[PDB]
Design a binder for this molecule. Structure first.
Ligand SMILES: *[C@@H]1O[C@H](CO)[C@@H](O[C@@H]2O[C@H](CO)[C@@H](O[C@@H]3O[C@H](CO)[C@@H](O)[C@H](O)[C@@H]3O)[C@H](O)[C@H]2NC(C)=O)[C@H](O)[C@H]1NC(C)=O
Ligand SMILES: *[C@@H]1O[C@H](CO)[C@@H](O[C@@H]2O[C@H](CO)[C@@H](O)[C@H](O)[C@H]2NC(C)=O)[C@H](O)[C@H]1NC(C)=O
Ligand SMILES: *[C@@H]1O[C@H](CO)[C@@H](O)[C@H](O)[C@H]1NC(C)=O
Ligand SMILES: *[C@@H]1O[C@H](CO)[C@@H](O)[C@H](O)[C@H]1NC(C)=O
Ligand SMILES: *[C@@H]1O[C@H](CO)[C@@H](O)[C@H](O)[C@@H]1O
Ligand SMILES: *[C@@H]1O[C@H](CO)[C@@H](O)[C@H](O)[C@@H]1O
Ligand SMILES: *[C@@H]1O[C@H](CO)[C@@H](O)[C@H](O)[C@@H]1O
Ligand SMILES: *[C@@H]1O[C@H](CO)[C@@H](O)[C@H](O)[C@@H]1O
Ligand SMILES: *[C@H]1O[C@H](CO)[C@@H](O)[C@H](O)[C@@H]1O
Ligand SMILES: [Ca+2]
Ligand SMILES: [Ca+2]
Ligand SMILES: [Ca+2]
Lengths: 487, 484, 413, 88, 93, 37
């Protein structure tokens, strides 16, 4: 193996912030200067440090509640939500000491299938879901019935619509090629006289046969459309509290650890369903050489005869199958190497309805949740969170990773980077393969910092993995340099 | 071929007794693995750690003092008062439900699939699960629920003739120590197959009026296939702040001295693991390999006269087939054959028995930082100091070379080379020819060098042997340096 | 000549142990027997009654405000009435005429038939399992309900079994490896020589490992069986080898601190076959040899009677095995598991601190287990001849050799 | 419900052959000579491309994934599956 | 040849321990007839070992170790049982 | 089998076929103290 294992390096510490007026604390942090890769040391030694202070400054942190303050969670429920026979506080506190219970839901009701997943934030730069940011177990007044098929559902307060938009693309290509060539060239020669004589032969073949198959099947099934309300969202307890812990002063660390727990954005609108994708590539070759000769001479005489015969064959085949959404038996029977029968497809699509994946998303950045009805100093938290979001996007984008071999895709998983391999190579760098060459796709290096003013510039070099090596593939798809106005 | 050299177990002599603690009535002492018993050799009766009774002069600490709030009478946990009488058993004694949120109905839903395995510590030297680090069943006053993506399960009703899906296990309760658990259904499968064949046939004849005739045939065939399939039933992330430790880890952490004492800290690393899971992926994995080599060679030579003939033929087949997750039955079935029967049935069993696919983990000392207990900095630095030694002393790299690609492990004081084929030892083979492909794997750390104020070193070798025959070299960090 | 059991002289006797009302004597084993001579059956020690030469000390080891049960055992008062088999036997009915309340409220939970057996004693000689030192029908007032197990049915996990996780894993390893060869030659009055040789080699290895989870035993607050704690109370306190060996021979040198449950199958075919011939006349000679070893072995462990013994032999024969026969056997591992492999803790770690004289008993056990491993050593026996090695068994040392050398010492060919 | 289905195939095969044979003799010291040659080149190709893009809107997700699944033997789609979709 | 019909298979031994006598007889009868037992048979035998077990291996100690320590001349009786056990080895060849 | 013949000589045979089996139902181990006879 050509490897050197590379250790993670965090920076030297920031200077401390001055002590916060309302957290009574101070903060310091490091930037990841190099991610751990190829089995270097696991690092993650605490990326933030925090200390207490004496406080010499005023604070106004109590945003009041015309509602009822829930005993454990601190949520402000509207006073009409008490004694409805339902948990609106998160920890049941709204339903204590009620002289009667006034149910609105006359009937039993389901939550829409998977509606809680969409209540959590996404780290948009890795498409990973993170912690809960919205409370889809909160209904306010609720209890207007919705039906998908014959099942009745209760709409969450935060959800503007969840509805069964229901669509299916299937796409199929089967491309096949065959090419064969045969060459033969025979010869015979003779002489005699009354003494002398000669006889000679040559016979030959060259042959080749070649075949290729590319097959690609994709089903994009959609089974629901989701949109969140644009305003007045009831947030989740665990997020609401970490946002209340954020400093008024800008420390990057304490805002970064919000993103590492609850992500960077929230899902405002989404397309729900399943992907089935199958793609087969096969290449096949056969090759031959034959060469035969005799030479015979007489006057006393001599004979020589030779035969040479060669056959070569190869086949190489790669298949990838990818399934999203559904139930585990349908998932595995589609995961299997052989194209489905329509019965499995039917049962998979039927199960995708009850456990959809997310096909398409409209985000909003997470600071758009930090509204003054829930948080004091909200505008300074927003402005901090905006700046942290730009700095964090420059940390968690995988451009920092060293290049994989074998066309591996590097993904920065934490403070550590994993080369996800294509089919047909193994080992931590994707080095272990039988293949003489495989197309390297070009990989971008990280984008250089904003220079000067009157229109700043940023630059990129396609250098992190240079595109051409070992019969290279496509050079990178994005803007190779970029500019934006001070004002 | 290689040859073994047996060695029996040795431990170093006892450390002097650690002085009698105020609340445990206990003393501790330890020893070190001066040499673990290698492939050939007797086990020590002795282990690394010893504990003894002792009365002590002072009075044990008052249990009323934690957080200005409730703490349980016979165990570790200190609780926010709204957990007392919540209707749920928040500590081992149940004292947080004695003399009575309130009356929680949330136990209508069972705990999340695999809430246990993610709560256990893990050991990087042995790959074993440890005791509970997190409390797998602490709910912290929360009534929080995950939708089961797999709840769909058929039932007949014989009265009024209907076939209908059960409406059972639709939700699971999430433990407080889990930030998110997500029931996302994925599959990915990747399959590569490569075949290469060569056959060559040759003749040569000369006659002069002496005769010579030569005939050759050669054949080679190679087949490879690899299949990898993974199915996620769920993905999880454990909380990074306000962690509620298991009562056992909590009590064992109270029981740690504030001073450094390698024995009691090494015992906590043994008992609660080197690491704890921060996040991981749940469901099932199938992996399969076939590697097949065949060859066939024949040759004849005749001249005048005398005749000689030779033939050689070969076939070597490796199948590795490993199923993680599912029912014990269908895991054996899918290990034995691959089909739309075995994949479909295996996935039906992943509905009920998921297993951890891959996960992320951090060193056990990094838990203390994030606990509900407040600062424990002295214990954390001791717990790091011990772990930085434990990962040297108990390390499988101290076992023998395991020639022909065997896997070393240390358990107790004792080595196992899990040799992949042939009878165990340093050397391992009796079936294979002496031509076999095998790696070099690490010959372990030196102690730190004598040092200048700014120069100190540590070194390795790739193995005691070089890589065997033609074979792979190690990942290449041969030398390392330290702060002296 | 053949070999007989032999021992040292007996040592000098103990004093009378005042509370135990006995005296003790011991002897070393020196040869086990070998080569089909007089096999040992012979004991390490013996005991005699005495009227004691001094008073016994106060026996009672009471934990205080804890309930002292009809067993040897103390318990905390939350478990004095708990509607459960608290404290190692029923001991409670005269108190619990009130406060019935169970650990599990309104529910019907069953015992884990795997967890009851968790924490086997193990003897390092042969690595046989023995029944648990640990109680494992004690629940510490915790309900601790698991829905786990592949048969989709709930169970109550017993207190000492800190983890029992059904990590299902099914592996098959298969290897075949052939090398196959031929060499032949040929070369008034006349001369000729004809020569031929042929060789065939096969190595098949197959193993199928099927897990039914893993148990990890608790490393504090372990609640032990009444029989085991009593069998620690009844000890000499003076390092009498034969009396300590009697405790090892009923609870093991070690316990499995964590063990992996399930089943295994394993198969071997080795075939190694050769034939050689030469014939000639020179102005007759005819000289031959044949050498064959053929050895096929099958092991199955775990699962129920029918399926295992079907599969054992189906796999040994040429038979193309039905996948559903595997599914049946591998499913029956749910009902009838076996201990595949495990981590071993020396048994003295289960001598509870907060019992009288505990640490003295531990250092005695640590010495005794070292002796138990030493005088049962193979290294004392006489050497095997040719390619064999000295096998050890109770009352014999021997060897056997599938390699054309023969007898109980492989001496002849 | 929409289907586009498209099948396209091309085949070529070629064989070309050339041959020469020559002879000479003389007599009065007799003698004769002969020469012969043959040559072949042959080549062929196939291309086959089969595409299809079923698209459905409306109906239940299982009926959609069943109906949109392309039977290469019946690329318009099957009477039973299609009627089930029209029910859903 | 028809090996199951033929006189050719003769010289097979039988040892068989435990199980219900029907299935032990059937296995013996097939072998002394010069014929193979079917895999059906062995599993039927293995099912019957639940009724009628035998010991495959044993670890052995002389019986005097059972003589209770409370016996009124205990050590003398045990010592005479050792003196008696020792004579069996001479009482037979 | 081995033969040397010259019209010194020697001739040798050794041959067997074994089938061996075990069926195992359970281990028992029994007390060495507190025995009730
Ligand atoms: C140029 O010379 C080559 C080599 O001699 C010719 O190929 C040969 O063609 C003959 C007649 O088709 C083949 O003989 C046949 O063999 C088959 C079995 O393979 C047998 O069933 C038939 O009855 C007959 O004996 C011969 O095998 C084949 N040799 C090779 C190596 O391909 C070729 O046809 C010649 N071309 C010209 C222009 O004459
Ligand atoms: C697993 O078992 C199945 C049994 O059906 C195998 O599938 C059969 O394979 C044989 C091979 O000769 C074919 O003749 C049958 O037609 C196949 N039946 C079908 C359609 O399933 C399967 O091949 C086995 N697993 C593997 C990978 O060989
Ligand atoms: C071989 O002979 C036996 C009788 O000994 C007869 O039953 C059998 O049919 C013959 N062959 C077969 C079909 O097994
Ligand atoms: C001699 O030749 C015969 C006939 O092939 C053969 O059976 C025998 O084994 C050879 N060896 C001798 C007779 O020494
Ligand atoms: C923040 O950082 C400096 C580093 O020298 C500390 O010493 C000090 O506490 C300051 O507030
Ligand atoms: C502790 O180890 C010491 C060796 O220094 C012994 O002397 C003592 O008996 C105990 O084994
Ligand atoms: C030897 O090999 C492993 C790689 O498998 C390294 O992680 C490690 O350094 C070990 O000692
Ligand atoms: C020890 O052996 C002596 C023999 O010297 C006997 O007297 C006694 O019975 C014990 O076995
Ligand atoms: C431009 O964006 C901000 C402005 O300071 C910084 O992250 C950096 O200067 C970047 O290049
Ligand atoms: Ca309410
Ligand atoms: Ca409680
Ligand atoms: Ca009770």
């Amino acid at each position: 193996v050509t490897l050197m294992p590379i250790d993670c390096e965090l920076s030297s510490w920031s200077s401390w912030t001055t002590c916060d007026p309302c957290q009574k604390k101070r903060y310091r942090y490091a930037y990841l200067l190099q991610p751990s890769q190829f089995h270097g040391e696991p690092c993650n030694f605490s990326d933030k440090e925090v200390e207490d202070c004496v406080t010499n400054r005023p604070c106004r942190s109590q945003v009041r509640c015309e509602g009822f303050v829930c005993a454990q969670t601190g949520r402000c429920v509207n006073r009409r939500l008490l004694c409805n026979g339902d948990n609106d506080c998160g920890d049941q506190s709204d339903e204590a000491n009620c002289r009667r219970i006034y149910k609105k839901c006359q009937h039993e009701m389901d939550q829409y299938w998977g509606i809680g997943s969409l209540a959590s934030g996404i780290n948009l730069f890795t498409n990973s879901f993170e912690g809960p940011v919205l409370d889809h177990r909160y209904y306010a007044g609720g209890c207007s019935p919705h039906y998908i098929l014959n099942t009745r559902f209760r709409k969450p307060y935060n959800v503007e619509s969840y509805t069964p938009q229901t669509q299916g693309k299937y796409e199929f290509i089967l491309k096949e090629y065959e090419s064969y060539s045969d060459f033969e060239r025979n010869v015979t020669e003779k002489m005699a006289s009354k003494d002398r004589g000669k006889h000679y032969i040559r016979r030959t073949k060259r042959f080749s046969h070649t075949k290729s198959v590319f097959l690609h099947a994709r089903s994009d099934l959609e089974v629901a459309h989701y949109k969140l309300k644009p305003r007045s969202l009831m947030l989740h307890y665990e997020f609401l509290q970490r946002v209340k812990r954020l400093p008024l002063e800008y420390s990057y660390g304490e805002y970064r650890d919000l993103f590492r727990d609850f992500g960077t954005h929230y899902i405002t609108e989404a397309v729900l369903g399943g992907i089935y994708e199958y793609t087969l590539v096969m290449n096949k070759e056969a090759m031959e050489r034959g060469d035969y000769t005799l030479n015979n001479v007489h006057a006393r005489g001599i004979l020589n005869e030779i035969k040479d015969r060669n056959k070569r064959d190869t086949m190489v085949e790669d298949l990838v199958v990818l399934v999203r959404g559904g139930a585990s038996e349908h998932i595995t029977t589609l995961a299997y190497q052989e194209l489905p029968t329509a019965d499995l497809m039917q049962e998979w699509g039927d199960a995708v309805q009850y456990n959809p994946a997310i096909i398409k998303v409209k985000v909003e950045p997470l600071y758009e949740l930090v509204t003054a009805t829930d948080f004091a100093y909200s505008s300074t938290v927003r402005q901090n969170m905006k700046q942290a979001l730009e700095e964090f996007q420059k940390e968690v984008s995988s451009c920092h990773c060293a290049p994989c071999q074998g066309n591996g895709v590097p993904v920065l998983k934490g403070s550590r980077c994993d080369c996800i391999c294509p089919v047909g190579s193994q080992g931590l760098a994707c080095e272990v393969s039988y293949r003489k060459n495989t197309p390297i796709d070009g990989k971008w290096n990280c984008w250089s910092n904003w220079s000067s003013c009157s229109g700043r510039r940023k630059t990129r070099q396609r250098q992190c993995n240079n595109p051409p090596p070992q019969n290279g593939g496509s050079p990178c798809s994005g803007p190779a340099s970029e500019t934006l106005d001070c004002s | 071929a290689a040859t073994p050299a047996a060695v029996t177990c040795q431990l170093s002599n006892w450390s002097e007794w650690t002085d009698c603690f105020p609340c445990q009535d206990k003393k501790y002492r330890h020893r070190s693995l001066l040499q673990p018993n290698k492939f050939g050799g007797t086990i020590c009766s002795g282990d690394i750690w010893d504990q003894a009774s002792c009365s002590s002069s002072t009075t044990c600490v008052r249990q009323a003092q934690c957080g200005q709030d409730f703490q349980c009478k016979e165990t570790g946990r200190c609780l926010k008062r709204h957990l007392v009488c919540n209707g749920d058993q928040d500590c081992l004694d149940g004292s947080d439900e004695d003399d009575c949120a309130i009356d929680e109905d949330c136990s209508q839903y069972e705990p999340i699939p695999g809430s246990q395995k993610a709560a256990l510590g893990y050991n990087i030297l042995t790959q074993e699960d440890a005791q509970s680090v997190y409390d797998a069943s602490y709910y912290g006053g929360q009534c929080e629920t995950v939708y089961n993506g797999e709840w769909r399960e058929l039932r007949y009703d014989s009265t009024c003739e209907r076939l209908y899906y059960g409406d059972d296990e639709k939700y699971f309760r999430k433990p407080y120590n889990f930030l998110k658990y997500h029931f996302e259904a994925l599959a990915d499968t990747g399959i590569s197959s490569e075949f290469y064949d060569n056959a060559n046939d040759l003749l040569s004849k000369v006659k002069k009026d002496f005769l010579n005739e030569l005939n050759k045939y050669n054949e080679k065939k190679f087949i490879f296939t690899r299949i990898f399939t993974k199915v996620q039933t769920a993905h999880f992330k454990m909380r990074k702040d306000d962690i509620m430790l298991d009562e056992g880890m909590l009590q064992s952490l109270m029981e740690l001295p504030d001073q450094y004492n390698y024995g009691m800290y090494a015992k906590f690393i043994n008992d609660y693991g080197t690491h704890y899971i921060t996040s991981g992926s749940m469901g099932g994995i199938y992996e399969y390999i076939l590697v097949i080599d065949k060859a066939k060679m024949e040759s004849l030579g005749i001249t005048s006269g005398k005749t000689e003939r030779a033939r050689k033929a070969m076939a070597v087949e490796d199948i590795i087939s490993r199923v993680r997750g599912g029912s014990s039955g269908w895991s054996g079935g899918l290990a034995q054959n691959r089909s739309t029967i075995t994949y479909r049935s295996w996935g039906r069993s992943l509905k009920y028995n998921p297993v951890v696919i891959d996960f992320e983990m951090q060193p056990i000392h990094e838990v203390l930082r994030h606990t509900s207990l407040g600062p424990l900095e002295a214990k954390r630095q001791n717990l790091r100091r011990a772990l930085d030694q434990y990962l040297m002393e108990f390390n499988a790299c101290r076992c023998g070379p395991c020639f022909n690609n065997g896997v070393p492990i240390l358990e107790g004081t004792s080595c196992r080379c899990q040799c992949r084929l042939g009878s165990l030892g340093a050397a391992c083979e009796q079936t294979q020819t002496e031509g076999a492909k095998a790696d070099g794997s690490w010959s372990c750390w030196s102690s730190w060098s004598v040092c200048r104020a700014g120069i100190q070193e540590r070194r390795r070798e790739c193995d005691n042997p070089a890589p065997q025959n033609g074979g792979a070299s190690c990942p290449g960090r041969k030398v390392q340096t330290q702060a002296c | 000549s053949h070999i007989d059991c032999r021992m040292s002289p007996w040592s000098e006797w103990s004093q009378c142990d005042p509370c135990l009302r006995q005296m003790f004597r011991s002897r070393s084993i020196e040869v086990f027997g070998q080569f089909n001579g007089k096999r040992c059956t012979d004991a390490v020690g013996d005991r005699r009654q005495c009227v004691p030469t001094e008073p016994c000390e106060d026996a009672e080891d009471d934990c205080g405000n804890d309930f002292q049960c009809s067993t040897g055992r103390c318990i905390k008062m939350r478990l004095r009435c708990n509607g459960d088999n608290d404290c190692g036997d029923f001991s409670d009915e005269d108190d619990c005429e009130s406060e019935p309340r169970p650990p599990c409220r309104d529910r019907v939970v069953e015992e884990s038939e795997l967890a009851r057996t968790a924490g086997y004693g193990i003897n390092i000689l042969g690595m046989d399992p023995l029944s648990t030192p640990f109680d494992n029908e004690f629940y510490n007032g915790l309900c601790n309900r698991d829905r786990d197990g592949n048969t989709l049915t709930y169970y109550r996990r017993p207190w000492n079994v800190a983890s029992l996780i059904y990590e299902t894993k099914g592996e098959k390893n298969f290897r075949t490896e052939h090398y196959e060869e031929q060499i032949e030659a040929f070369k008034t009055y006349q001369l000729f020589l004809s020569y031929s040789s042929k060789k065939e080699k096969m190595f098949l290895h197959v193993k199928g490992e099927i897990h039914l989870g893993r148990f990890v035993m608790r490393n504090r607050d372990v609640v032990l069986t009444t029989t085991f704690v009593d069998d620690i109370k009844a000890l000499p306190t003076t390092y009498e080898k034969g009396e300590y060996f009697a405790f090892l021979e009923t609870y093991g040198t070690h316990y499995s601190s964590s063990g992996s449950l399930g089943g295994l199958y394993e198969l071997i075919y080795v075939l190694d076959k050769a034939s050689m011939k030469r014939k000639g006349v020179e102005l007759a000679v005819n000289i031959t040899s044949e050498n064959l070893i053929d050895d096929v072995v099958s092991l199955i462990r775990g699962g129920t009677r029918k399926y295992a013994f079907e599969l054992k032999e189906k796999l040994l024969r040429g038979t193309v095995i039905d996948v559903t026969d595997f599914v049946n056997w591998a499913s029956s591992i749910n009902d009838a598991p076996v201990l595949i492999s495990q981590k071993l803790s020396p048994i003295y770690n289960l001598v509870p601190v907060k019992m009288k004289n505990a640490h003295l008993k531990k250092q005695n056990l640590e010495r005794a287990i070292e002796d138990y491993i030493n005088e049962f050593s193979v290294r004392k026996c006489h050497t095997c001849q040719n390619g064999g090695t000295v096998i050890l068994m109770d009352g014999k040392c021997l060897c056997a050799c599938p390699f054309k050398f023969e007898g109980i010492a492989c001496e002849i060919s | 419900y929409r289907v586009l289905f498209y099948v396209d195939s091309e085949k070529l095969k070629q064989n070309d052959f050339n041959s020469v044979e020559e002879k000479k003799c003389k007599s009065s010291s007799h003698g004769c000579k002969e020469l012969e040659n043959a040559l072949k080149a042959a080549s062929g190709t196939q291309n086959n491309v089969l595409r299809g893009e079923p698209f459905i809107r409306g109906g239940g997700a299982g009926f959609i994934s069943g109906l949109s699944y392309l039977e290469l033997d019946n690329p318009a789609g099957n009477k039973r599956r299609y009627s089930a979709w029209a029910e859903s």
